Amino acid sequence: IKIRKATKEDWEKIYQLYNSLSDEDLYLRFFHLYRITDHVTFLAEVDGKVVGEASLHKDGEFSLVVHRNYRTLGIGTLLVKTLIEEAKKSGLSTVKFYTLPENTPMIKIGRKLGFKMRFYEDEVYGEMRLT
Ligand SMILES: CC(C)(COP(=O)(O)OP(=O)(O)OC[C@H]1O[C@@H](n2cnc3c(N)ncnc32)[C@H](O)[C@@H]1OP(=O)(O)O)[C@@H](O)C(=O)NCCC(=O)NCCS
Secondary structure (H helix, E strand, C coil): CEEEECCHHHHHHHHHHHHHCCHHHHHHHCHHHHHHCCEEEEEEEECCEEEEEEEEECCCEEEEEECHHHCCCCHHHHHHHHHHHHHHHCCCCEEEEEECCCCHHHHHHHHHHCCEEEECCCCEEEEEECC
């Protein structure tokens, strides 16, 4: 399980990962964007195949997705920890995420990592002040 920073040359690999995900997975991966309508990306690789992708934006917001067959192995948690580390190195004041209330796995990660949660019927908001 290797976690590395993504480069422009990884676009094709990420594209293939996305093509294998469900519409539900993609909806959750870009939840906030769907709701309201530079960045650093990390990938989780098994062999030479990207099985997980996580991105951090300049405003502290992050998101990620792990292929269904590679879930519950701790990858999502490791990717979020990687993003938090990146956020601290880049001097961000806060990191945050948005998802659906039914997304138990993500909320579990958020809570165990220290994120303060705000719940609503249409969405949930997690946030952690770093500075
Ligand atoms: C949310 C997501 C990244 C989690 O990734 P993952 O690799 O499975 O994460 P982890 O293995 O670190 O597990 C996270 C926790 O959720 C739990 N979990 C997994 N499946 C579960 C299920 N069906 N019910 C309950 N809990 C579940 C894990 O057991 C673990 O428990 P813990 O936090 O006490 O250790 C993954 O499910 C995913 O890609 N989902 C679709 C995209 C998405 O929702 N992205 C979120 C963006 S903010």
